[PDB]
Design a protein around this ligand. Structure first.
Ligand code: MG
Ligand code: ZN
Lengths: 226, 76, 198, 243, 190, 749, 123
DNA sequence: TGTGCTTATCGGTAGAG
DNA sequence: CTCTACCGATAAGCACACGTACCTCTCC
């Protein structure tokens, strides 16, 4: 958002409204925006007989370049729509003539303040204990498989342990030592007492898979070290 | 201790991360600091001055290992 | 029968080249013989019977190899048992038979049954028309002995199964007669590598 | 009325394995030359003058000869008297759900109802065979679905009545099943459920699941849509769509 | 007799002569070559073993450089290390066709990783399970995360296998480290 | 209650028998009309859990409850194994039936239910009553057990990929990004409204400030350089983030509404290793090809081209001292003492301005553009490109090979100084660049040259179309009677080109090389001050093929799909109303069924297109906007990463796999000088370099005979299918002794 | 039509072969075929313009409207025979094609801050 | 919407009395 | 001379994916 005193101004004092890059034109291949600008400029500048003026822009019956350049030359401007401007920051003249003209632009419904999805600590999922995917709430950003796969190649396993276990859904699981079943504080029904029960730190997805494998009829034996 | 003779960047980023967590938990620095409060700036100077009591247990794929030292290794 | 003789000359030349590459002391008169030295010098009505020979290794004359040419295709239990008895009565260990068509399934079990002493490698006549080792794609395959395999396993401190693997169905493992558990040295055109026959 | 040109699967002795002309009418596959002789035609000459080919091919004449042979083998003396109509009646009557009308009258209201005479629908059958033979001989292009010449659109005069009918067929079945229980030991505004059409139309307008044109279940989605009210151009192009 | 050939053999579709500049299987020290397309043999005979019976014209074709273009047929005729070079020559021509420049050391790792078991395995779940079945290293959780969890967990439970948690997903799913940049050393010893 | 902390090592997969099914369930229920949501239910309508103490669905684990049946039944996972002992009490072969299969898990007399936290219940609350029908109790058990989320009908792989593989995390943000060239390359512009609400963990919680590193990402992660750790710079803007436009090439995005989400690390152990391995100071070398990752953009590239190729726009002292305020190094000698008898001030050339970015100990030499740099002074340059762009011998790669410690501020100073110089000059696109002529007579001569060049290219294609096996009697040097009747067929050749696939494939290549002389007319008629020619010779955006379609003619318009209509070779009003035209359908030359569209547009994008020409352009450009077949670079990258993400480099010097320390390679390739790769995951960065080429590939086929470059990579990578299509293409060669005769190779082939 | 009398039919206009959102785009045959497909389909439905002349009988979830809507300076035949001013949703601004300190790179836009607070593009 | 994996069915072949 | 067991084509039956992020409206 540049101020009015910093824009390259025309000799009539007309500052531009929206400045676009010249590099977008050879790649996108859009001629006719400059033709619409040169037509709407020649319409709006006064002639120093306004009848029989080229006002039509019917697509499959467009006028030629010689009909637009002559209309822009009769108004008292250059033929190619470019005008000599001066630098608003220093006053010096520019070596090239800058193309100017009124062009019908549009404002889309995609604004930047409707896309902000910041989150520090918010609500969790009732099933998987993951953060929600609602921008009206605090939300959260899905650390997908590709963001893990490109962090594996960088050798960063400290953020990979934080963004998958610490900052994600973390839980706690108790494992019997002499027995090899999941002990639910902790008490092993197979063992005589809860004298040898160790606790490992696993994410909630591991327990959600364990309680599902036990639901489908598959038990698991957990061999721990410490 | 006959594997590479050079400290890798992956072990260096863990040694500095351990030393910063140690200094952030109010530990006495082995190097003399002169006007500094960031723990990473003390950790990089301790790594460049070879005055840190850490040992690297470089594991081997066969099952054994080679216990190294920080002062034995060199940093470029 | 001229086309059959022109095929059989290439079969014999590829067989002699394979036995020379394996190291079984093939003479120079059998390696550089032309078509004229194969027809006029040898017999004319052979009927796949005059090609049966016995070759011994260059380092030791105790390890022999008998090349068997069958008289007809689709060989069965009787002729394979006769070849097995002929190999057992002459106290040889390894045999090579060059059959024409595919074997019967009842004769394919007698090779796996009597496999402690006799090791009969089956070769097709279509596979021995073009030499496999004499190609620009195939690199140099050097067979390592046990004394080299021990110091190779002691150099990298690896196991016998922690290696790249080849199979016995591959034509390179059949060109040298490689059993399971051997290590082959491969030099690429240096950067060398090692495989393990599974 | 589907007339195909394929190989002779029926009565194949592993030698006569050329193409043949069969039809698919009322779920009964009969040869086309029996259907020619069942309607007015009494000879093979006037049956070939109806199928005006005017060409020179070997896949057309051999197929016509195979059709004549499979018509003469499946029915004995079919070219004399009225023996073809008995085979036509027995083929329709052997179906899973045959019509209760007589087969002499099923050829007047099911086989080409836009034509009046029984001999004219044989000439139309010969014209339909002639178009198929001209398309097989390469002198005629097949109909493509991408062209708008062979396509008709339906906005509300066929999309709405085909959903009205599938609810009226349920309202006429929920009426007899409630009047049968009150007939053997009442006004007319008691058995006719007036809400079964409204609750079906509101559900079809809300969920978007419209009735399939060639099925009963598997309701398609993408018939109705919501309007956009951001600018008058979006609601103008939303009323100007064709899917 | 109208579908019987009077020239050539029955199982060859079309043969065209092409000019090349960087050909596969190069010579010792631009050339013309032929590209033979053969029909699919319904029997047990291979297409190469039927192309070899080229019995009237055997010396005009350089048999020290000819090879099938398919990799699965190249490893069945000339070995795995000879089809590996064709795989590298095809990968270096398929990467450069997309307008990208890559190093050869990245392709020589994929070529030696897809040919550990003696043949080029498939990229699907069967080709990944065969590399573990040949090398005798069970990994049920990674194969479950690849294509199907239930169909792999049922076969893992019915056989009584044990997962040693050697991969990266097996470590990152139970709160561990993979062990490449962080996990293959220990500075806890003082 | 304080239990010790251990580490999980190995997990065993076994089928549960009836012995642990009752030992793992706590307070099992047996009544039919009893849900028993008091000992195993977290969302139950009670005050606390009876098993747990004070439960609030956070410190309570879901308990199980068994439903003991009356009689035993065969386990439903063993019905496919008991049909092997029988042909349709086998104590003779009993030893093989309990060693590998589990015999204790064969009898099923109980079945547990899921806790209320994981819910489903309408079937398990119906088979709890013990009744008869022994043969149909398993028919309810196998349907109650098939309601798991591991099976399918969040089910199957969708459960795994989004619970265990893909997880969400806290301390994240996502905002739309814009451009700010005033920032450093290792700095990201975080607004003061979002950074004030973003809390970090410091030894208590404090707000985000300057200097803190944050890991940024642009979805999707196309390769490993899409994750850059940048430092937070607090800006007075709001609801938007900003970085340099130079760093859009690692992110592979543009300022287009394209969002860019970041991840804020909390611990100091993740913060120390973030700016030591992941930041932009460490990702200087592009891992795919060994070159530099960052390069010049479009404005900087155009302003660096224009400051070097002009050599006649001299700067004075007051402009040079203004431009030196953004340059890191000092001022050179002026080198122009007097350029005129009325010159009262020393002037400065353009190549001395670009030479203020180089260090004094920097040497550079490019022989293709005559670029000679000696002692930090650009001495010579003459009409060349690709030494400022991305290449093997560019000056940014040599500057990275020189010091690699102070290049990130050299690129920033170049982007500032060239943007100041291009603002002092001014770059614009007017109608004179589109007209490509000076006056009306030059434009008329240009159109008369285009109208003859297209007519000559049509004759070139008509000549090349005769190279088939049907005109061999005509191509030979003999006496032909139809030699004057075969050349005049101007419409029959266009009809025969579109009906077959090989004649169009040999004519597209015959038009594309004859069009290289038609495209060479933009340099004769166009001026040196043309903006499109400047942006095409600089290599910033566009080429000459875009300028030819802008000014002179569109050219060849063809599609690689077989349609049911052709093009009438004129694209006029009379060609559309022709009944015997290939546009309608079967022209009758016996009917037609399919066409390969081939049409040349004589008009351009400046003079306006005909409605038939616009229809032709729409048909030929519809294939470029489909958004289909996009699952290939996703699933190919996924199946390539599952095969390669576990390969690393060992400390002994070998390339090992992670599954059992199995050997893959013995040593690494000798193409790189850096041999200190002993802790990097080589397989992951080897699969990322292939997936980045897989996403940035053309997903459209060139013709009907060839295929797309994406499908050609997919067929090469997925080549171990060991079956398919029965093609088996071979490639035979020729012998060396065939060259002893005159044209011996052609006769032999 | 004037010189050859061999047609026996004629069209009203060549621009009436397009939709209502495509026949109002000026110089539509001059642009690329992929770029007019964006404007006639996606950019025409998202452009904030006129909403309603009666916002009291409308209680729709979301409604947006500019303060000063403007018709364009050109005159297409569709907007001349349709007599609908709501076919164009936006405002015409003085657009210059120039570089502005590298702040318009990668398809960015530099706009006048002083003109936006005078009533331009305010909704 | 079709591609891939596993299993039942069927003809041709070979050893034995 | 016949009787009986094992293998390579030929259909038949069943699980397989549809990108990665996010972003609302409308009904269940
Ligand atoms: Mg964009
Ligand atoms: Zn509880």
């Amino acid at each position: 958002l540049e101020e009015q005193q910093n824009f390259p101004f025309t000799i009539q004092g007309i500052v531009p409204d929206i400045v676009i890059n010249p590099h977008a034109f050879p790649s996108r291949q859009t001629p006719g925006q400059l033709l619409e600008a040169a037509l709407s400029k020649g319409i709006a500048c006064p002639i120093q007989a306004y009848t029989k003026l080229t006002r039509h822009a019917t697509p499959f019956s467009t006028p030629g370049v010689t009909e637009i350049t002559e209309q822009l030359h009769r108004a008292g401007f250059s033929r190619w729509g470019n005008e000599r401007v001066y630098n608003g920051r220093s006053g010096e003249m520019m070596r090239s003539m800058i193309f100017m003209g009124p062009t019908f632009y549009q404002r889309l419904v995609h604004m930047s303040e409707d896309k902000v999805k910041f989150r520090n600590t918010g609500p969790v999922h009732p099933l998987t204990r993951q953060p929600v995917a609602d921008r009206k709430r605090f939300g959260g950003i899905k650390f997908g498989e590709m963001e893990r796969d490109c962090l594996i190649a960088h050798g960063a396993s400290a953020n990979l342990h934080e963004r998958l276990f610490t900052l994600s859904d973390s839980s706690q699981m108790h494992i019997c030592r002499k027995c090899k079943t999941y002990a639910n504080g902790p008490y092993c029904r197979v063992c005589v007492s809860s004298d040898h029960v160790v606790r490992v730190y696993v994410p909630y997805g591991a327990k959600l898979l364990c309680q599902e494998l036990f639901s489908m009829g598959i038990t698991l034996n957990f061999d721990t070290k410490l | 201790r006959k594997t590479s003779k050079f400290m890798t960047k992956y072990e260096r980023a863990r040694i500095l991360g351990t030393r910063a967590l140690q200094i952030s938990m109010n530990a006495p620095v082995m190097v003399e600091l002169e006007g500094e409060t960031d723990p990473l700036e003390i950790a990089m100077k301790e790594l460049r001055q070879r005055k840190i009591p850490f040992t690297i247990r470089r594991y081997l794929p066969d099952g054994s290992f080679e216990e190294w030292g920080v002062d034995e290794l060199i940093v470029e | 029968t001229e086309e059959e003789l022109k095929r059989l000359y290439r079969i014999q030349k590829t067989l002699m080249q394979m036995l020379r590459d394996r190291g079984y002391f093939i003479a120079d008169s059998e390696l550089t013989m032309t078509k004229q030295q194969f027809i006029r010098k040898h017999g004319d009505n052979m009927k796949r019977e005059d090609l049966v020979t016995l070759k011994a290794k260059r380092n030791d004359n105790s390890d022999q190899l008998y090349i068997f040419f069958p008289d007809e295709a689709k060989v069965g239990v009787k002729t394979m048992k006769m070849y097995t008895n002929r190999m057992k009565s002459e106290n040889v260990f390894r045999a090579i038979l060059v059959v024409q068509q595919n074997l019967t399934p009842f004769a394919r079990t007698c090779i796996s049954e009597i496999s402690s002493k006799f090791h009969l490698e089956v070769f097709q006549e279509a596979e021995m028309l073009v030499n496999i080792k004499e190609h620009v794609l195939v690199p140099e395959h050097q067979v390592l002995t046990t004394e080299e395999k021990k110091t190779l396993l002691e150099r990298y401190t690896v196991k016998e199964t922690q290696l790249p693997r080849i199979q016995v169905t591959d034509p390179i493992a059949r060109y040298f007669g490689l059993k399971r558990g051997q290590v082959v040295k491969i030099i690429r055109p240096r950067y060398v590598t090692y495989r393990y026959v599974v | 009325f589907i007339v195909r040109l394929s190989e002779n699967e029926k009565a194949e002795d592993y030698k006569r394995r050329e193409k043949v002309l069969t039809v698919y009418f009322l779920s009964t596959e009969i040869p086309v030359w029996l259907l020619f002789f069942a309607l007015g035609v009494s000879s093979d000459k006037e049956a070939m003058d109806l199928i005006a080919f005017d060409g020179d091919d070997a896949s057309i004449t051999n197929s016509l000869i195979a059709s004549i042979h499979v018509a003469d083998a499946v029915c004995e003396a079919f070219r004399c008297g009225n023996n073809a109509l008995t085979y036509v009646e027995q083929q329709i009557k052997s179906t899973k759900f045959p019509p209760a009308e007589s087969v002499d009258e099923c050829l007047h209201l099911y086989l080409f109802p836009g034509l009046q005479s029984l001999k004219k629908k044989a000439r139309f059958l010969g014209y339909m065979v002639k178009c198929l033979l001209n398309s097989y001989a390469g002198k005629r292009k097949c109909e493509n679905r991408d062209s708008f010449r062979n396509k008709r659109i339906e906005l509300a005069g066929e999309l709405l009545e085909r959903e009205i009918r599938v609810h009226l067929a349920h309202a006429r079945r929920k009426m007899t099943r409630a009047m049968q229980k009150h007939l053997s030991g009442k006004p007319i505004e008691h058995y006719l459920d007036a809400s079964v059409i409204t609750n079906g139309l509101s559900r079809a307008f809300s969920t978007g699941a419209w009735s399939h044109p060639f099925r009963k279940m598997e309701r398609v989605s993408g018939v109705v849509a919501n309007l956009g009210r951001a600018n008058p151009l979006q609601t103008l192009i939303d009323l100007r769509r064709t899917r | 007799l109208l579908d019987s050939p009077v020239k050539g053999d029955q199982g060859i579709k079309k043969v065209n002569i092409l000019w090349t500049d960087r050909p596969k299987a190069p010579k010792r020290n631009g050339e013309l070559y032929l590209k033979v397309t053969m029909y699919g043999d319904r029997g047990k005979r291979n297409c190469w073993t039927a192309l070899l019976e080229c019995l009237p014209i055997m010396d005009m074709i350089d048999w020290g450089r000819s090879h099938p273009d398919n990799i699965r047929q190249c490893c069945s005729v000339y070995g795995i290390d000879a089809g590996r070079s064709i795989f590298v020559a095809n990968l270096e021509s398929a990467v450069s066709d997309t307008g990208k420049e890559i190093l050869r050391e990245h392709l020589l790792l994929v070529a030696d990783s897809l040919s550990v078991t003696g043949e080029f395995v498939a990229l699907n779940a069967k080709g990944w399970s065969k590399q573990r079945q040949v090398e005798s290293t069970p990994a049920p959780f990674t194969q479950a995360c690849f294509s199907s969890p239930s169909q792999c967990f049922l076969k893992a439970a019915k056989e009584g296998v044990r997962d040693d948690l050697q991969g990266s997903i097996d470590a990152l799913a139970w709160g561990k480290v993979p062990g490449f940049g962080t996990g293959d050393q220990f500075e806890i010893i003082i | 209650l304080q239990v010790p902390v251990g580490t999980l090592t190995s997990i065993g997969f076994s089928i549960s028998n009836n012995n642990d099914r009752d030992k793992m369930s706590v307070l099992e229920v047996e009544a039919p009309n009893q849900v028993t949501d008091s000992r195993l239910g977290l969302p139950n309508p009670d005050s606390v859990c009876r098993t747990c103490g004070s439960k609030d669905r956070k410190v309570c684990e879901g308990h199980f409850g068994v439903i003991n049946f009356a009689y035993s039944i065969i386990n439903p996972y063993f019905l496919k194994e008991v049909a092997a002992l029988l042909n349709k009490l086998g104590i003779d072969q009993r030893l093989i039936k309990k060693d590998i299969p589990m015999f204790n898990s064969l009898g099923l007399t109980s079945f547990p239910v899921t806790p209320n936290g994981y819910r489903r219940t309408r079937i398990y609350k119906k088979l709890v009553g013990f009744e008869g029908n022994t043969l149909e109790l398993s028919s309810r058990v196998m349907e109650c057990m098939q309601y798991s989320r591991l099976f399918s009908e969040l089910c199957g792989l969708r459960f795994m990929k989004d619970v265990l593989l893909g997880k969400r995390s806290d301390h994240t943000f996502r905002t739309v990004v814009v451009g700010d060239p005033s920032l450093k390359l290792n700095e990201i512009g975080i607004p003061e409204s979002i950074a004030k609400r973003l809390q970090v963990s410091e030894h208590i919680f404090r707000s985000l400030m300057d200097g803190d590193t944050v890991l940024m990402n642009r979805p999707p992660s196309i390769h490993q350089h899409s994750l850059i750790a940048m430092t937070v710079r607090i800006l007075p803007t709001t609801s938007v983030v900003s970085l340099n436009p130079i760093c859009c090439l690692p992110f592979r995005g543009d300022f287009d509404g394209d969002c860019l989400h970041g991840y804020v690390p909390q611990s100091i152990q993740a913060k120390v290793e973030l700016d030591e391995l992941v930041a932009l100071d460490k990702q200087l070398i592009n891992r795919q090809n060994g070159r530099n990752l960052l390069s010049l953009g479009q404005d900087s590239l155009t302003a660096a081209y224009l400051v070097n190729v002009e050599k006649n726009c001299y700067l004075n002292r007051a402009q040079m001292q203004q431009l030196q305020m953004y340059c890191p190094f000092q001022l050179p000698p002026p080198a122009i003492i007097k350029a005129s008898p009325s010159s009262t001030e020393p002037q400065w050339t353009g190549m001395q301005l670009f030479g203020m970015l180089f260090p004094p100990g920097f040497d550079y030499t490019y022989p293709l553009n005559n670029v000679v740099v000696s002692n930090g002074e650009l001495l010579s340059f003459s009409e060349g490109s690709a030494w400022l762009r991305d290449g093997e011998g560019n000056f940014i790669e040599r500057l990275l090979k020189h010091d690699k410690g102070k290049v990130l501020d050299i690129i920033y100073s170049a982007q500032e100084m060239l943007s100041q110089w291009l603002l002092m000059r001014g770059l614009s696109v007017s109608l004179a660049d589109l007209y490509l002529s000076s006056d009306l007579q030059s434009r008329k001569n240009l159109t008369e040259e285009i109208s003859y060049g297209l007519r000559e290219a049509e004759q070139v294609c008509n000549k090349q179309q005769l190279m088939v096996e049907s005109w061999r009697d005509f191509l030979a040097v003999n006496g032909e009677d139809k030699e004057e009747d075969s050349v005049s067929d101007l419409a029959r050749f266009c009809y025969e080109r579109q009906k077959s696939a090989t004649l169009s494939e040999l004519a597209v290549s015959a038009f594309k090389d004859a069009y290289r002389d038609v495209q060479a007319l933009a340099y004769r008629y166009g001026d040196q001050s043309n903006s499109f020619l400047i942006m095409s010779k600089a290599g910033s955006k566009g080429n000459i093929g875009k300028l030819v379609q802008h000014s002179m003619c569109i050219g060849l318009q063809n599609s690689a799909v077989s349609l049911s209509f052709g093009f009438p070779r004129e694209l006029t009003c009379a060609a559309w109303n022709d009944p015997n035209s290939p546009l309608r359908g079967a022209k009758g030359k016996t009917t037609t069924e399919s066409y390969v569209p081939y049409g040349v547009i004589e008009n351009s994008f400046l003079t306006g297109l005909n409605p038939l020409e616009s229809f032709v352009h729409s048909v030929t450009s519809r294939d470029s906007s489909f958004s289909g077949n996009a699952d290939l670079p996703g699933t190919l990258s996924r199946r390539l990463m599952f095969f390669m993400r576990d390969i690393y480099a060992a400390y002994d010097g070998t390339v090992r796999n992670s599954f059992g320390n199995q050997l893959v390679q013995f040593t690494y390739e000798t193409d790189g000088p850096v041999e200190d790769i002993t802790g990097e995951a080589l397989g992951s960065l080897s699969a990322c370099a292939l997936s980045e080429a897989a996403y940035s590939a053309l997903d459209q086929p060139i013709s009907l005979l060839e295929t797309s470059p994406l499908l050609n990579l997919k067929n090469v990578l997925e080549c171990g299918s060991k079956k398919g299509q029965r093609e088996q293409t071979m490639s035979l060669y020729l012998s060396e002794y065939l060259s002893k005769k005159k044209h011996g190779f052609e006769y032999g082939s | 039509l004037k010189e050859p009398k061999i047609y026996t039919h004629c069209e009203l206009d060549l621009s009436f072969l397009l939709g209502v959102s495509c026949a109002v785009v000026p110089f539509a045959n001059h642009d690329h075929g992929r770029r007019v497909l964006y404007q006639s389909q996606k950019h025409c439905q998202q452009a904030i313009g006129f909403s309603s002349t009666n916002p009291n009988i409308r209680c729709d979830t979301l409604s947006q409207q500019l303060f000063y809507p403007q018709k364009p300076l050109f005159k297409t035949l569709a907007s001349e025979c349709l007599k609908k001013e709501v076919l164009f949703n936006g405002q015409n601004a003085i657009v210059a094609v120039n570089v502005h300190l590298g702040y318009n790179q990668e398809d960015s836009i530099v706009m006048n801050k002083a003109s936006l607070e005078r009533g331009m593009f305010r909704s």
